[PDB]
Structure formats: structure tokens, C-alpha cells
């Protein structure tokens, strides 16, 4: 039952490490999962639904890790606070580079993927803005830009920059440098002027 | 001759304001340009080549405007310097929102579009880094991050944020706010700490 579903998911994530979703057949996923093609369709309506599920698991993994941090403030300076949070996305998505790259591509063709990404980005931006607001209330950050607009640009920067690094795009920040790069821009723009 | 080509280009840009390239036929472009379908193929091998040409014109328009600024330093403070430069992209791409949105989508399917965008992004990042380097040399900016890595993240932020605003994505910064938002992040991250 659920074993077969997890096997389909594992096959898909493994095959996506070597070629795009368009070059992966339903027969490919069935074979790698040890089932027939009609048995596959019992668990998933299409290979695109498999990717949707894989991406849903990754985004919820990142969201739950961020929720854990928010309930467990690490005892450090403000710079380290932001780094620990950005690192949740660096580590979670960087551990699922194939699903991440495939999910970004599917945003152009799948309404559910686009809506899934949009829902979680709105959640993460709202949390970023709430923390900026708290920092302003306690006197640690200046009241410069509207906090939600700042949070939006910083989160969109992280999306584009992290995914360019993971995919090895040209241009991109080297993966070994991208965390320091983003943290610097977040901290100077949140606390500067 | 060139009149027919410009007519095809104008028809394509007009039709892209209402539906994606996948929903525009070669017959659509021929009809709107007042020519036959075989005559169309004399000027362009495909509708994708039409988009490639449209995007090439827009990116070169932005590049030439930025080159004009670089040769004509406006007499203002450092903040205004950066704003005037970011504004080149805000105005150029914001005046061609349909071609911009279609070109971004084609990056996933067209090697020439992806290489075109990558070439000009590398050029614009190198220029950004050169200006940051000049500001550090004259003593106006601190030596914090590697300038080219900072420039990469700031330019990728601008790409993602401007295009989200133009497309009305959720989430996005309102178009009337995106210039102030980006300028703040550039100036604080280039001159801060
Ligand atoms: F402490 C905090 C509180 C909020 C907070 N928000 C963050 N930014 C985000 N990055 C992404 C993202 C997107 C695509 C790929 C990788 N990452 C989505 S939202 S980092 C952080 C740290
Ligand atoms: F003075 C200067 C010197 C360099 C400089 N570079 C800039 N950034 C760029 N933005 C984009 C972009 C991409 C996609 C959509 C819109 N814009 C490409 S490169 S703004 C600026 C101002």
C-alpha cells in the first residue's frame, strides 16, 4: 500500500537526478517501483502528480524546520539568528536539488505547483516581516522600508539565488559562498540606515 | 523587406500581451503582419525565433541605456546613482512586460534564450562589481563581501523581484514600490558595515 507509493516517490526523485520530468515515463516510475503501469495509476493520476507530492514533502520539511527554530530561539547575536533561519532553506532544498529544480520548472505548467509555491512563500514572507517588525519594536532595527515589502524582496532574492547556485547556473554565487552572501544582504538591509 | 519583419515583430509583441507563445500560431503572426505563412518562414524559422529576436531587442535596449549612463555620470549622491541605474531596467523591461514575461518562460525550453539572458546578466553583474570596486577604492564603501558575489546576488534579486512585480505574481512587491525597495537593499548592502 503506502510502501508502493513511497517506492514510486523514491524512484521519481532518483530518476530526476539524471533527466527532466519530460524524459521520465510512467513506465519508468512503475518499473523502478516494481509495479505495473495500471498499478501506478492507482496511486497517482500522472507523473506530474508525483512531482507535486515530492515538492509538497520538501516544502513542508522546510516549513516545519523553520517552525521548530521559531519555537526554539538559538542563543546568539542577531546575525546568527538570520543565518540559522536562511540555513533551513539552504540545507533542506540543497538536500533535494533534483526535486527543487524540477519543481521550479513545473511552476510554468502546473497550477497546483505554482499555487503550492506561492502559498508557502507568502507564509515565509509574513514570518520574515513579523520578525523584522519585532526587531523594530524592541529598538534594534530602524523603521526604513515597509517591513512586508522588504521581506518580500529578501525572500525572492533567496529563492532566485539559492536555486541558481544549486543548479550551477551562469551566473550564480558558488554554493560554498551563497549563505554568507545572503546573510550579509539580509542583515545590512534589515539593520542599516 | 525589413518592413515585413518589423510587422511580424510588432504582431508578436501585440499578441503576447493577451496569451502565451504556445497559444500563438505562425498563421496568427502571418495574418497580423499581412503576409502568407510561407512568406513568414522566409523571415523567421519559427515563432520561437520571433520571440528570441524580440527579447534580443529589449535586452540590448537596456544594455545600451546602461552604457549611456556609465558614460554620463549624473551629478547626484550615491543613492541616486544606484537608483538611476536600477531604473534603466525598471523602465526598459516594464515597457515590454509581455516580451519580458514570455522570454523568462522560454528560458526553460530555448537554449538561445537561456544563453542570451545569461550573457547579458554576466555583463551587468561585472559592471555592478566594477562600480562597487571603484567605490571601495575611493574609500566610500567598506571591503565586506567579495564584490562579484555581492553583485551577483543583487542582480538576481532585481531579476526575480522586478519580474514578479510586472507579472503581478503572488507574492510580489507592488510595481509602484519596487524601485525604492531594491534601491534600499542595494545601498545598505553595498555601503553597510
Ligand atoms: F529567521 C528567518 C526568518 C525568515 C526567513 N525567511 C527566509 N527566506 C526564504 N527563502 C526561501 C527559499 C526559496 C527558494 C529556495 C530557497 N529558499 C523561501 S522563503 S530565511 C529566514 C530566516
Ligand atoms: F548603476 C548601476 C550599475 C549596475 C546595475 N545593475 C543592475 N541590475 C540588473 N537588473 C537586471 C534585471 C534583470 C531582470 C529584470 C530586470 N532587471 C538585470 S541586471 S541595476 C544597476 C545600476
Swiss-Prot record, chains A, B:
It holds the Pfam family EthR_C. Inhibited by tert-butyl 4-(3-thiophen-2-yl-1,2,4-oxadiazol-5-yl) piperidine-1-carboxylate (RF1) and 1-(thiophen-2-ylacetyl)-4-(3-thiophen-2-yl-1,2,4-oxadiazol-5-yl)piperidine (RF3). InterPro entries: EthR_C (IPR049397), Homeodomain-like_sf (IPR009057), HTH-type_TetR-like_transc_reg (IPR050109), HTH_TetR (IPR001647), Tet_transcr_reg_TetR-rel_C_sf (IPR036271). Disruption phenotype: Cells lacking this gene leads to ETH hypersentivity. SUPFAM superfamilies: Homeodomain-like, Tetracyclin repressor-like, C-terminal domain. Residues 25-44 bind DNA. Keywords: DNA-binding, Repressor, Transcription, Transcription regulation. GO terms for molecular function: DNA-binding transcription factor activity; transcription cis-regulatory region binding. The keyword Repressor applies. The record marks 155, 158 as: Inhibitor-binding. PROSITE patterns: HTH_TETR_2. The keyword Transcription regulation applies. Residues 2-62 form the HTH tetR-type domain. Binding of inhibitors to EthR induces a conformational change in this repressor, which is then unable to bind its DNA operator, consequently allowing for increased transcription of EthA and bioactivation of ethionamide (ETH). Homodimer. Involved in the repression of the monooxygenase EthA which is responsible of the formation of the active metabolite of ethionamide (ETH). This is HTH-type transcriptional regulator EthR. It comes from Mycobacterium tuberculosis (strain ATCC 25618 / H37Rv). The gene is ethR.
Amino acid at each position: 500500500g503506502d510502501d508502493r507509493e513511497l517506492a514510486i516517490l523514491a524512484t521519481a526523485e532518483n530518476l530526476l537526478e539524471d533527466r527532466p520530468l519530460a524524459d521520465i515515463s510512467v513506465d519508468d516510475l512503475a518499473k523502478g517501483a516494481g509495479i505495473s503501469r495500471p498499478t501506478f495509476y492507482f496511486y497517482f493520476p500522472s507523473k506530474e502528480a508525483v512531482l507535486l507530492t515530492l515538492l509538497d514533502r520538501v516544502v513542508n520539511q522546510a516549513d516545519m524546520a523553520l517552525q521548530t527554530l521559531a519555537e526554539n530561539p538559538a542563543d546568539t547575536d542577531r546575525e546568527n539568528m538570520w543565518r540559522t533561519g536562511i540555513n533551513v532553506f539552504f540545507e533542506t532544498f540543497g538536500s533535494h536539488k533534483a526535486v527543487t529544480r524540477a519543481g521550479q520548472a513545473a511552476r510554468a505548467t502546473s497550477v497546483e505547483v505554482a499555487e503550492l509555491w506561492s502559498t508557502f512563500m507568502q507564509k515565509w514572507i509574513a514570518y520574515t516581516a513579523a520578525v523584522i517588525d519585532a526587531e523594530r519594536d524592541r529598538g534594534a532595527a530602524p523603521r526604513t522600508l515597509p517591513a512586508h515589502e522588504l521581506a518580500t524582496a529578501l525572500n525572492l532574492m533567496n529563492e532566485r539565488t539559492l536555486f541558481a547556485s544549486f543548479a550551477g547556473e551562469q551566473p550564480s554565487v558558488p554554493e560554498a559562498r551563497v549563505l554568507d552572501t545572503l546573510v550579509h544582504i539580509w542583515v545590512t538591509s534589515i539593520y542599516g540606515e
